[PDB]
Structures are given as C-alpha cells and as structure tokens.
C-alpha cells in the first residue's frame, strides 16, 4: 500500500546501510538499492522507480524467496501492505472415485511495487516467516484488472 | 468356435433370422423358415430346389413378418415393384 508520504512513521524509514553523503551534492537525492529476486521473475520498474521503504519487499527489501512458488486469486485487499489469496483445488475421495471442491486462504505480503485489487490472479513466493501468518510474498501479477476498463457508461 | 490346434469344437452353429441377423435359438418355436419354389421355363416349379428365408419369432410377433419378406424376396429376385424403400 503505503500511498503518499513514505516518511509517515515515528521512526525515520531508510534502507539499511545505504548511505548518502550530504557533502557530495547529488541529483538522485537518495542512493537506492534493489535486487533481482530470481527464477526469471521480473523485478518490476515501480520497485526501482518508486521511493517506498518496505523492508519485506522481495525486490528492495531484506527477504529472500525460496522453496514453494504458488499462484492464487486475490480475495481480500483490506490489510495494509498485505493481502489474502484463495487457492482452490479438487480433492479426491477414492471410495467414490470422484472429487470435491476444497480451498485454503494464504495470507501473503505484497510490496507497494504492485498495485493489486480483488479478483487478480497473483504469483506468490515462499519466504521466511514475515508475520504470525504470512509465509509467502507477492512476486508477479498475472491478471490486470479483470476487464475493468470494459465496464464504462453508455455508448 | 475353434480350439488350440484349429479343431472345430462346441457343436451346433445355430441358424439366423435373415430379417434381423439375430440367432434363432432352439426353443424359439415361434420362428419360421419359408421355402420358395424355383420355377423354370413356362411354369414347372422345380421340386427339391428352394430359395429359403428364415424369420425369428420376434419378427413375426411384431407383425413385420410380411413386410420383411417383401424386402427380402424382392432384391433376391421374386418381386416386381411391390416393396418400397421409401415412405
């Protein structure tokens, strides 16, 4: 999320150990740092362009993505800098030789590099424990808006 | 119904209703077999020479015994225009 005035906390936000010497008159005004997550996941330009300060970002922060990579559809965007996705799957009962619809919701951190809204399929990647429940991080958006621009007024 | 070294086993290859090509079993005492004579030059039905058709009991019960014969005897020769392939 984080929207407008990154310096909005009691503690000054900053990237760790990314020093900017004031004696040397610079034009970028803040030496910024970013990494490439890996597995061919494009580190989106908004992470390099933007000036957010999220330390749980997989592109600008101090987490790493390793292990399971999962996808799922977004079902709530009501938490700040974190969402919840619904991953669906059919589960097999042998005795009847048929299936049943099951599902699990996965809480997943989302860097302000991405702008998400409910309905979007998203690719997440497992990282270290981020919070009490978050064990995945949003890493690539597969939808755009779920045909939102094609829902305008009369012709 | 052969066996390992070709020898014909399992007696009694049954008949077959020429209208349905289904089997005419033993106890099918409702079936039939119709012998048609072989007429020659100027009358003279040849005795002992037949054009035989066999019909199941199921066909004759359903009434199709008549209509099915017209079709079977016509294209086998002994009918001039009576039967119709269209309706």
């Amino acid at each position: 999320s984080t929207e407008l005035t990154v310096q909005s906390e009691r503690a000054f936000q900053k990237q760790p150990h990314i020093f900017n010497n004031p004696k040397v008159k610079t034009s970028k005004r803040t030496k910024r740092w970013y990494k490439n997550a890996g597995l061919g996941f494009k580190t989106p330009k908004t992470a390099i362009e933007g000036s957010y300060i999220d330390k749980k970002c997989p592109f600008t922060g101090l987490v790493s993505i390793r292990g399971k990579i999962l996808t799922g559809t977004v079902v709530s965007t009501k938490m700040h800098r974190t969402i919840v996705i619904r991953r669906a799957y059919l589960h097999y009962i042998p005795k009847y030789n048929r299936y049943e619809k099951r599902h699990k919701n996965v809480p997943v951190h989302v860097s302000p590099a991405f702008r998400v809204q409910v309905g979007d399929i998203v690719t997440v990647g497992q990282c270290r424990p981020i919070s009490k429940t978050v064990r995945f991080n949003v890493v690539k958006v597969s939808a755009a808006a779920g045909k939102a621009n094609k829902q305008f007024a009369k012709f | 119904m052969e066996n390992d070294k070709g020898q014909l086993v399992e007696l009694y290859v049954p008949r077959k209703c020429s209208a349905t090509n289904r089997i005419i079993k033993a106890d099918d005492h409702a079936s039939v077999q119709i012998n048609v004579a072989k007429v020659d030059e100027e009358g003279r039905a040849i005795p002992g020479e037949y054009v035989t058709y066999a019909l199941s009991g199921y066909v004759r019960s359903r009434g199709e015994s008549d209509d099915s014969l017209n079709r079977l005897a016509q294209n086998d020769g002994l009918l001039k225009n009576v039967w119709s392939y269209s309706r």
């Binding site: 059919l90 097999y92 009962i93 005795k95 009847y96 048929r98 299936y99 049943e100 | -």
Partner: protein, 144 residues
C-alpha cells in the same frame, strides 16, 4: 438416475449422505453412541462378576409352562442389579444367596433368550469353581 448425484465432483455430497444414512444402521448407531458403556449392565465387556441377592422362580413365557431358576445379581464394578439364569437341571442348589457368581451374556446380542422374560445373562461360575464342573462332579464348591 434416481437420486444419487452421478457427477464427477459430487463426492462431498456422496460422502455426507452415507455418513447421514449410516445412522439408520442399528449397529453403527450403538457403536458411536457408546451404548455398551452408557447402557448395558456389563461395562461393554464379555463377562461381569457380581453377587447374589435372592433366588427367583421366573415363570416361563407362553406357550411354555415352567419355573426357570434365576438369581438377582449386583455387579461388582457397577452396583447395577441384574436377574440372571442358572441353567442345567439342578444348579440352583449351588448358588446360595450372598455368593459371588460370574455372569455372562446369553448369546442374543442383548435380547433375553427364550421363554425366560427379561433375562439377558446366565451364570458361568459360582465361588470361582465353574458351574459346569459342579454339575458333573469334577470340582467341589469351596469352604464358604
């Protein structure tokens, strides 16, 4: 198809219906309600040892006409009182109220046996010496 959803993703509906309809199964019902533990003088066990209160002349049901010799027993582990049969002509001379008999099921899954009304148990031992043995001559009943 008459009822049962034949769909390939209808397993939940098919499981739950089974679950539900098992309850009409008399045995499945008892097994999950733990009836043997709740009801059923025996705690769910094969036998149960108890103590003789009084010797009863239970009169057989129709069309039979007899006096079936039985004993009212107060089970040790339970205190539950139970009237139980003493089979084998004689054998009511062996019991002698206040004694310690070993009851057993009658072999009808509850369900009192025969012309004997409301007797779901039979005696197998008294004073720890095997009713059968006393009947023949093999053992003798202990001191007191």
């Amino acid at each position: 198809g008459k009822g049962k959803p034949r769909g390939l993703n209808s397993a939940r509906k098919l499981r739950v219906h089974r679950r539900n309809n098992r309850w009409a199964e008399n045995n499945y019902k008892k097994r999950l309600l733990g009836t043997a533990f709740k009801s059923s003088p025996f705690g769910g066990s094969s036998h149960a040892k108890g103590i003789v209160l009084e010797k009863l002349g239970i009169e057989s049901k129709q069309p039979n006409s007899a006096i079936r010799k039985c004993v009212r027993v107060q089970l040790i582990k339970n205190g539950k009182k139970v009237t139980a049969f003493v089979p084998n002509d004689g054998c009511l001379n062996f019991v002698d109220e206040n004694d310690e008999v070993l009851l057993a099921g009658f072999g009808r899954k509850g369900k009192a046996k025969g012309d004997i009304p409301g007797v779901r148990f039979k005696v197998v031992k008294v004073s720890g010496v095997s009713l059968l043995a006393l009947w023949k001559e093999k053992k003798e009943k202990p001191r007191s």
